[PDB]
Amino acid sequence: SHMKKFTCVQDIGDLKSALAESFEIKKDRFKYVELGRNKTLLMIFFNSSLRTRLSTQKAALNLGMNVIVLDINQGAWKLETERGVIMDGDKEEHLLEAIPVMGCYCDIIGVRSFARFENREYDYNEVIINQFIQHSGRPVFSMEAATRHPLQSFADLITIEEYKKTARPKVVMTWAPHPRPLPQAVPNSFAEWMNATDYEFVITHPEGYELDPKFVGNARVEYDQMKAFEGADFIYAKNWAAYLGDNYGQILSTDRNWTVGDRQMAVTNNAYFMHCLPVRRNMIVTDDVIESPQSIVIPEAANREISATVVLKRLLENLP
Amino acid sequence: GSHMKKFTCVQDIGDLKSALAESFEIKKDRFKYVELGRNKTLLMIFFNSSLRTRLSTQKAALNLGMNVIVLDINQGAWKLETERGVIMDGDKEEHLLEAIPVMGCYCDIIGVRSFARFENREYDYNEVIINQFIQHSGRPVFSMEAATRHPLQSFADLITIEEYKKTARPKVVMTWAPHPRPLPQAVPNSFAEWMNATDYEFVITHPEGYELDPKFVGNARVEYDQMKAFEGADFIYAKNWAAYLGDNYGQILSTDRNWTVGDRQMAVTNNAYFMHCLPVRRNMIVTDDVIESPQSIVIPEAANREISATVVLKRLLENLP
Amino acid sequence: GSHMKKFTCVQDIGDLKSALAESFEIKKDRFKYVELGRNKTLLMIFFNSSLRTRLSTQKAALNLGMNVIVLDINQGAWKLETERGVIMDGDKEEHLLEAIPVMGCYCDIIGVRSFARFENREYDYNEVIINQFIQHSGRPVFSMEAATRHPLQSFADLITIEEYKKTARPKVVMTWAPHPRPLPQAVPNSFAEWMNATDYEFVITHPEGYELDPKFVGNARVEYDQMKAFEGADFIYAKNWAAYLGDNYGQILSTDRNWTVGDRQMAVTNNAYFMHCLPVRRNMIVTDDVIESPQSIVIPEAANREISATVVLKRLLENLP
Ligand SMILES: CCC[C@H](NC(C)=O)C(=O)O
Ligand SMILES: CCC[C@H](NC(C)=O)C(=O)O
Ligand SMILES: CCC[C@H](NC(C)=O)C(=O)O
Numbered sequence: 001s002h003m004k005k006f007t008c009v010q011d012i013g014d015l016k017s018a019l020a021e022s023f024e025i026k027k028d029r030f031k032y033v034e035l036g037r038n039k040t041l042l043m044i045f046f047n048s049s050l051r052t053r054l055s056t057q058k059a060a061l062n063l064g065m066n067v068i069v070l071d072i073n074q075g076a077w078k079l080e081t082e083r084g085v086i087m088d089g090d091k092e093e094h095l096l097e098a099i100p101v102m103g104c105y106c107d108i109i110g111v112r113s114f115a116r117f118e119n120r121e122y123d124y125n126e127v128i129i130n131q132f133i134q135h136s137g138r139p140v141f142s143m144e145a146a147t148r149h150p151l152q153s154f155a156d157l158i159t160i161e162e163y164k165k166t167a168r169p170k171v172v173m174t175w176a177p178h179p180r181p182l183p184q185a186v187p188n189s190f191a192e193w194m195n196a197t198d199y200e201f202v203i204t205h206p207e208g209y210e211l212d213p214k215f216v217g218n219a220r221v222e223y224d225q226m227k228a229f230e231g232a233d234f235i236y237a238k239n240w241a242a243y244l245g246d247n248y249g250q251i252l253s254t255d256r257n258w259t260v261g262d263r264q265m266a267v268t269n270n271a272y273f274m275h276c277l278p279v280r281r282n283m284i285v286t287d288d289v290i291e292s293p294q295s296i297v298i299p300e301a302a303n304r305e306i307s308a309t310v311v312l313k314r315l316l317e318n319l320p
Numbered sequence: 321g322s323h324m325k326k327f328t329c330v331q332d333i334g335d336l337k338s339a340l341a342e343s344f345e346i347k348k349d350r351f352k353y354v355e356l357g358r359n360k361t362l363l364m365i366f367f368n369s370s371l372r373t374r375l376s377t378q379k380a381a382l383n384l385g386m387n388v389i390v391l392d393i394n395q396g397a398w399k400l401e402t403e404r405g406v407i408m409d410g411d412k413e414e415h416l417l418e419a420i421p422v423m424g425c426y427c428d429i430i431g432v433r434s435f436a437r438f439e440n441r442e443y444d445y446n447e448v449i450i451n452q453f454i455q456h457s458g459r460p461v462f463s464m465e466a467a468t469r470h471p472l473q474s475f476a477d478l479i480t481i482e483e484y485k486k487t488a489r490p491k492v493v494m495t496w497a498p499h500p501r502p503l504p505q506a507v508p509n510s511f512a513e514w515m516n517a518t519d520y521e522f523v524i525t526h527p528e529g530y531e532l533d534p535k536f537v538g539n540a541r542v543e544y545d546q547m548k549a550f551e552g553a554d555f556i557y558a559k560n561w562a563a564y565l566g567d568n569y570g571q572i573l574s575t576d577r578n579w580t581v582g583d584r585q586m587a588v589t590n591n592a593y594f595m596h597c598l599p600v601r602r603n604m605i606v607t608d609d610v611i612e613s614p615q616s617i618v619i620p621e622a623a624n625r626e627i628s629a630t631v632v633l634k635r636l637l638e639n640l641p
Numbered sequence: 642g643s644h645m646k647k648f649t650c651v652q653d654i655g656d657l658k659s660a661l662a663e664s665f666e667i668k669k670d671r672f673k674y675v676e677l678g679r680n681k682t683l684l685m686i687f688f689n690s691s692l693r694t695r696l697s698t699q700k701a702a703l704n705l706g707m708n709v710i711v712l713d714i715n716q717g718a719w720k721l722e723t724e725r726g727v728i729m730d731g732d733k734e735e736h737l738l739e740a741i742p743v744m745g746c747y748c749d750i751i752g753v754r755s756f757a758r759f760e761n762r763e764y765d766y767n768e769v770i771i772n773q774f775i776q777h778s779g780r781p782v783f784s785m786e787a788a789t790r791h792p793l794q795s796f797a798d799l800i801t802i803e804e805y806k807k808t809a810r811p812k813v814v815m816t817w818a819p820h821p822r823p824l825p826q827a828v829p830n831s832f833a834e835w836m837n838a839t840d841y842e843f844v845i846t847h848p849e850g851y852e853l854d855p856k857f858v859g860n861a862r863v864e865y866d867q868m869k870a871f872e873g874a875d876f877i878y879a880k881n882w883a884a885y886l887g888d889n890y891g892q893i894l895s896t897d898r899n900w901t902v903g904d905r906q907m908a909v910t911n912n913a914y915f916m917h918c919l920p921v922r923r924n925m926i927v928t929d930d931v932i933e934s935p936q937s938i939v940i941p942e943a944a945n946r947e948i949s950a951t952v953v954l955k956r957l958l959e960n961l962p
Contacts, residue, residue, distance in 0.1 A: 030359050033359060038672050038675065038703075040700060040703060042696070045396065048396060048397060048398055048413075049396060049397065050391075050393070050396075050397040050398055050414065050419065050422065050423070051422060053391070053396055053397065054363070054389065054391065054422075054423065054425075054426045054427075055425075055426055057389050057426075058361060058387075058389070058426040058427070061359075061361060061387045066703045068696065068699050068700070070692075070695070070696065071395075071396055072692075074395070074713075074716070075687065075690060075691060075692075075695055075713055076690060076691065076692035076695065077690055077692055077920045080923070083929075084929060085923070085924070086923070086924040086925065087922035087923045087924060087925055088821055088922065088924070088925050089821070091922070092920040092922060093692065093919065093920035093921070094921070094923050096923075096933075097919055097920070097921060097932075097939065097940070097943075098692065100940045101692065101693060101696075101919065101940060101943045101944075102692075102696065104697075104940065104943060104944040104947065105696045105697055105699075105700040105947055106700070179409055179410070277414065277418055277422060278398050278413040278414035278418070279414070279415070279418060280408035280409065280412070280413065280414075280415075281401070281406070281407070281408045281415050281417075282405075282406070282407040282408060282409075283407065283408050283409055287404070287405055290418075291417075297418065298418070298421045298422060298425065301418075301421075301422045301425055302425040304425075305425065305426055351680050354680060366717065369717065369718060369719050369734075370717060370718060371714070371717075371718035371719055371735065371740065371743065371744075372743060374712070374717055374718065375684070375710065375712065375743075375744065375747045376746075376747055378710050378747075379682060379710070379747040379748070382680075382682060382708045392716070392717055395716065500730050500731070598735065598739055598743065599719050599734040599735035599739070600735070600736070600739060601729035601730065601733070601734065601736075602722075602727070602728070602729050602736050602738075603726075603727070603728040603729060603730075604728065604729055604730055608725070608726060611739075612738075618739065619739070619742045619743060619746065622739075622742075622743045622746055623743075623746040625746075626746065626747055
């Protein structure tokens with residue numbers, strides 16, 4: 001296991017052993033508290049965060065690491081992302097100096113940088129997250145980039161294994177309405193990871209909301225929500241803005257009929273309800289559904305500490 | 321008392337005597353229990369500003385060798401929707417109902433600061449928010465100032481009065497003072513609550529209309545004449561608060577600068593010490609001269625916030641499963 | 642020199658030789674003194690933005706096994722009233738006079754960053770604020786950049802020049818450069834102050850009207866012809882600063898892009914290295930090509946900020962009561 005970064009499911013290697021370490025740590029949280037002694041983790045945020053912000057610090061502490069959270073934009077200087085521009089305006093520092101500089105004071109870097117929805121190529125080529133990998137001079141892990149969110153998916157995996165009633169459950173990812181255009185990072189990431197399992201994976205969303213093929217893989221895509229839900233064992237709801245052609249980053253619908261309510265859950269095999277959070281109640285899911293005992297939203301969130309501890313541990317183990 | 325499950329009111333601290341004992345024990349030997357909280361994580365959550373609580377609590381946690389995570393919800397996280405059963409099709413991204421449980425997932429103890437909102441007296445006085453953390457965080461919760469109390473502060477105030485008192489049962493007078501904005505009655509309520517728990521001679525003095533909730537006032541003497549209350553006092557605890565009674569909940573009834581604690585009033589005291597929880601608006605709450613006088617123990621007071629916090633944190637730790 | 646009570650100017654570091662010695666000692670063995678600062682708490686206070694100082698200082702403190710509390714006053718705390726004897730019946734909730742002492746209550750060492758306000762030259766140059774922390778914090782105070790100096794930076798600059806110099810006494814040229822906003826002369830002042838303390842050949846080059854305070858310029862050669870100053874330089878330290886003399890204090894006299902350090906000027910140097918404290922506005926202060934060239938040691942420089950901080954912090958620790 002030579003983890004040099006953590007941005008996609010490939011980086012975690014064999015899911016079996018990965019899950020093994022996961023539950024090992026769930027059972028004995030501070031087992032490796034000495035592993036990261038005198039090792040410093042730098043968490044950088046370009047966007048808001050409750051779970052990632054908190055869960056990652058806890059994870060680092062579980063490994064006895066030093067933690068430095070940097071909310072660039074608030075305490076530091078707004079960065080100029082484009083190269084070859086005359087910085088005679090708004091920005092004081094260029095990303096080109098910033099990244100290297102930040103790498104100077106830590107051993108591992110965590111970066112959260114939501115898709116900007118300004119240019120699909122820029123977003124999907126994951127320019128920013130890649131520059132940290134290229135010039136930080138340190139191992140970099142994603143706290144959600146423009147197109148993936150491995151730390152989240154990994155946790156989702158852990159919780160499904162943790163709660164599944166059979167070896168290969170039917171896991172259905174469903175779109176839901178949201179008032180703002182959200183990245184497809186979570187959906188992309190979830191699919192990517194589910195496709196890596198032997199689960200029966202199905203993706204259901206409205207017309208026009210198809211995700212990038214490379215992520216969809218060969219998962220069944222059902223345009224009829226009620227159909228996809230039939231006999232599901234797990235429902236993973238999440239909204240995302242359009243991706244195809246002329247609608248990149250746009251809201252094509254706010255059809256409240258997709259709001260995961262009791263109507264749809266009923267058709268499932270008494271499936272559990274999952275969501276990465278934050279969640280807008282009575283938009284993505286009904287108060288009753290999320291409050292029902294089938295909702296494992298919290299246990300899920302909880303596992304974020306685990307996924308992070310494992311990834312952090314791996315990265316540490318491979319530090320020079 | 322040694323079964324601390326939370327810390328929101330004076331009842332939670334148990335026997336004042338032993339509590340004060342631990343306090344001075346730690347004042348003397350600050351890191352005596354530095355190993356107690358090893359690998360134990362404290363989560364401090366702020367919904368409002370803070371200098372003293374923000375700083376003093378982190379130091380306290382470190383004194384116990386704990387891990388500290390300060391979260392300024394609203395800045396780094398997502399604004400929460402507090403009301404239940406609403407359609408979150410607007411401003412907010414996350415609901416308090418998910419937020420609290422989630423936060424509990426990553427720590428062992430939680431500290432919350434949530435000022436009274438002055439929107440609905442019942443909501444504030446039923447301490448809905450602070451209680452939901454207690455109900456759904458799944459962790460021991462301590463108040464960094466709720467809507468109606470501020471135990472961490474009062475406890476420190478107690479420690480400092482004991483620390484400086486010249487006699488066994490001093491006359492401690494709490495006095496209202498003018499302020500340009502409507503402030504919570506959390507500090508006053510809390511102070512009374514704690515003073516009433518002592519054998520001190522406690523007196524509360526404020527303008528007409530500013531009476532505090534009876535359950536807090538207890539049976540403390542209420543003097544509407546400031547100069548009278550001040551007579552022969554040993555300690556003066558000044559603090560402003562907005563009206564509470566009936567139609568004026570959360571409102572400024574007066575900004576009478578005559579109540580500003582100046583030399584005029586101190587003179588009538590028994591050379592009393594001056595106290596205030598801070599922040600303090602100079603020449604509004606108290607005169608520059610008074611606060612700068614040697615009778616002002618404002619800082620030593622503030623300093624004790626580290627102590628009160630260390631003790632509470634220690635107790636909470638000791639009772640962690 | 643070995644009894645550090647504060648760190649605001651080059652005098653505080655003592656003998657440069659031994660100072661540099663410790664510097665490289667730590668560069669080689671980063672956590673050598675990780676036990677030195679155990680159970681010692683550092684409080685970093687920011688009144689202005691910061692990437693390098695904010696990060697480098699926390700790392701430094703960790704290298705010494707210290708506790709770190711970063712406080713972004715203004716965001717999490719209460720805006721302070723700086724002027725004394727005012728009636729705080731407005732905007733501010735807390736006065737600097739209470740704030741400083743209070744903050745000192747919870748730490749062992751304090752780091753403060755407070756940019757020059759450019760409102761009154763005397764106020765800025767008398768370094769009123771940074772001095773009040775020294776006067777009333779009750780703790781050793783070190784500058785994270787005050788109104789007129791930035792020792793932590795200069796010390797690092799020194800370390801990197803020694804680290805890269807090709808001869809015993811290189812020609813180090815500090816050059817002004819255009820900037821759209823009026824910047825403090827703290828970095829330039831500080832750089833000169835430290836260079837003047839070395840046996841290097843030091844030259845300062847800037848446009849007419851931008852002369853720095855004499856006490857800082859010392860007896861360094863001042864060349865108004867940029868191209869002349871650059872001739873055969875071994876190190877180029879670029880940095881913008883607003884006017885200082887008489888009627889133009891804190892003002893932009895020029896934005897002459899001819900001073901932008903580009904290849905044109907570097908060519909005339911002795912293949913000199915390029916330095917800058919950062920942040921840097923590309924194609925304003927320096928050309929993309931210049932800063933990206935291999936002669937640019939901008940990052941190695943920034944990196945040394947961790948070292949300068951670790952040394953200063955170590956010294957301060959060693960002299961704690
Ligand atoms: C972790 C989720 C972050 C974000 N959600 C929102 C609502 O901003 C997203 O969809 O990527
Ligand atoms: C610690 C005091 C906090 C607050 N003060 C202000 C000014 O908001 C209050 O009166 O509750
Ligand atoms: C490192 C200090 C940077 C600062 N510059 C700005 C942009 O305010 C200054 O000139 O002091």
